[model samples]
Target chain A: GHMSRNLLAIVHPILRNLMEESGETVNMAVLDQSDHEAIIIDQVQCTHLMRMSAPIGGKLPMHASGAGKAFLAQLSEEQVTKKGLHAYTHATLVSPVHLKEDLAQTRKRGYSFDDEEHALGLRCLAACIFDEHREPFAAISISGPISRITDDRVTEFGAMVIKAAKEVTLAYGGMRGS
Target chain B: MSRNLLAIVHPILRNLMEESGETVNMAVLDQSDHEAIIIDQVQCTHLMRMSAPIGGKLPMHASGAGKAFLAQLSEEQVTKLLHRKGLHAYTHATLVSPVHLKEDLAQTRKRGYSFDDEEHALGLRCLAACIFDEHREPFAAISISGPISRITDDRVTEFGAMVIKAAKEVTLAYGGMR
Candidate 1:
């Protein structure tokens, strides 16, 4: 249910790089939270006094958080519909119709964005990172306080994250799990 | 990012109870009460039926879902609950003695289901099973309940099979690895 340690070890090399290029916290997350939620296996923290960042080994929700949404988009609609959507903030989507619409755009764009949905004053951008076999295994994301992570910054970070996802896939593979 | 376990599971309960013509319940262990907190319930349309309110609770030693959840925890954790608050008998059928409770839990593990023979309320019988987390620890339980007339002593095992099957489906739907 967890990623291989060898892959985990390889993830470190990309973290510092993503954080540098994106200028935000970089996260490597796996879908280990009951198969619906995401868990942070590794993180590269950013420099901010009032930062909104989940620590290494922290948990993220599948519907609201950036990485979780990217990973959730990989599953079929039937599987996604089975998961219950809980409201985290005013921006959290609890309706299936709206969520399905959001995820469709996510898949088409090859990335997902979090517009202060999971947290009150934070924003994030994430892209699914596949394994050597091209299976969606982990998510590569960049997140920061909404203060610095403006709407324009989200687009810039999105490009950086997808690049990071492609780079991580080159290093390791995804896990076959629920 | 937060998967609503209650939301993800209630539809499964609805499906089971609608077909079986019995009340179905979803609950999570409440540490403060040392009881199972009923989060949702699907009442059957049968003229003769049994049910509890959404916010109602059931003692761990007396209810089928409570016992099923208890059986999944470590012996030390289970002992801690009993030591802190000894089982207060809810009804004559409740297992008040520690020895009797352990025996029932052992049987629950062996059969992968728990039985409540009028333990929580007189004339009400139930069968239940637990759902797991990423660590394979049972954090929630689902149960099917009916009156003595319909849920006869001879039919207890039959009811147990349905509850066990439904619980697993709910667990799998919520992406439980266990």
Candidate 2:
């Protein structure tokens, strides 16, 4: 079903439930398997995350998005090599060494930040969950226009995604010895 | 011999069956034991897979959220754990050795969290942070997980930072020592 349609089916209800339970709005999007673009599933649920309307076929290259990079962080070098690091845009990191360095930095910094690598004016943040055995399981993220997700806001939103992910992970008993 | 059989029954022997029954009943009455039974039942209901944690597992180990809490430990404590538990290969993406894992843990100590971008496997990723206790030792780590395709590098980093922030706040709320 591609990324968009698949996410709408699986995450739409969860988004709706979040709104219903928290009385707070939510937004949902899906990333391609290659982590190249994001497909907006529901924006109005929480338009704050996406200032502009993301059309059904709208594509945002993975390199430009915090969410995309966060997702990319989960892949192995062999997997990335096998996937073929094709550049969707000039901003994409085609070199394996550079991408590895970036991943290492993400691990060190404890967060991911994306400049306008996908679209000229988009930025995002994301977090993932782990199994009890410490295997990566899933991820969650947020995004907005470059202007909206400024340096400070990027830091703020990034932290939010992390908190949400932790809550869900602890609920699942996926936490490990500190 | 038949007449002497009744007289031969000792008081201790007479109570053996009753004691055995009471012991069995007591095992069922312990709350923690019951909880363990319920958890097993739930696992069966969900048909979930359970696995063991391997050695040489760095406290940070690319999962930022898992690392967040581990950062609280002293270098000495981290070294002790590393010495006792040698690193093992969970995936080709794993650090696979103690030195690299130790370096990562050192960085996690500085950043106060951890990140995992498919270091555990291809197309899987997570962010983690550890929780601290009164003795300043790590008690647990929290993390989020998802498919690498869905969580990008930027998103994972942001989430790692956020998990650490939330963990700190929680620790503060819990009074840091308790």
Candidate 3:
């Protein structure tokens, strides 16, 4: 309990600064093991044009939200299969094959993208932070209107988030794995 | 909601601590049930070794951050809460009397900050400022705490100014009016 709290304290600020630089709003979600869901633990809003739907303590499905996808990317193949997936929106990756493909890409690139998969018109980019045990404990994400977070911008922000996540992992004395 | 808001503003506080050259731990508090909860924090290496991790609760009458939150409440609300919680002396410096507590809150509001001079713990000092939401209600407070030797009177004023500024910035980011 204290571990998640401590890690969030350390990384939340760093993620906020990154959001300021990108002119985007960010949310930090932590995985609640008992529930097997990603909960929006903290968030910062910088844009007046859009607002995030996930409030603090709000839950996100592991197959929909950007932070949720990042969390899913860290799970073992069997674990991922066991969790199953749901379609929250038209773009949600409910099919196991498609979901696996997305997770594979996220692992390869070190980040995850949500193209209105959970809430239509909202897009997000996220990356996971691992613990000392080399397991993902939480994920940080930046989200905004799809209009503002264009595909090109997603690629740019994705890299930034991945770097931020790595920095947080290091700060937490966590080991990052390929 | 407050947690998300703090995530947006925590970095600026960390930078302020870094520039001050005094190793300290920054805490953000939010009202939960009746007491102030340390929802998030960023600790400098020195402070991390000296103190326990974040996620603890502090009494409103005994801590700088808690008093800052107290300063934002109406007199009736404050009186009710104080009577309900019943101020227990944490240290000799704690404001145990209702009259003294009210006076301190007035000073806090006038100065736009609150101070703890070994009130919460012996040799520990802190400066705090409340962050208001759009409704002008205090939803969170931010503080910088360290040992008495490092947080001198002059340093307290400087830290007070920094904390107030950071709190204002966070308030604006959260879309708080005025």
DockQ of each: 0.01, 0.01, 0.01
Runs in model 3 lying further than 4 Å from the true structure: A1-7, A174-178, B1-178
lDDT of 1 by residue, A81-152 (tens): 774567878899888898888899889888888876786656788998775566786898887665467777
lDDT for model 1, please. Answer: 0.77
Q: Give the Å shift of residue A138 in candidate 3.
A: 0.6
lDDT of 1 at A160: 85
- Cα lDDT of model 3 by residue, A17-46, tens digit: 877866777777889888778888877766
Error of 1 at B175 (Å): 1.8
Docking class of 2: incorrect
**What does the lDDT read for residue B107 in candidate 1?**
94
User: Which structure among the candidates has the greatest DockQ?
Assistant: 3
lDDT per residue for candidate 2 within A1-178, as digits (tens), equals 2223443444445445443432223344455545446554454233221132344344444544555566567777676555465564566677778777776676666556655455444455666555476555445555444433567665556566676556645644522332
Q: Is candidate 1 or candidate 3 better by lDDT?
A: 1
Residue pairs with backbone overlap in model 1? A61-B1, A61-B2, A62-B1, A64-B1, A131-A174
Q: What does the lDDT read for residue B131 in candidate 1?
A: 79
Instruction: Give per-residue CA lDDT, model 2, range B35-139, as digits (tens).
Output: 100000000010001111211122233333333443454677656655665444556767756677667768777766566655654444555555455665544
With candidate 1 superimposed using the best TM-score fit, by how many Å does residue B122's alpha carbon deviate from the native? 1.0
Cα RMSD (angstroms) for every candidate in the order listed: 18.5, 23.6, 19.1
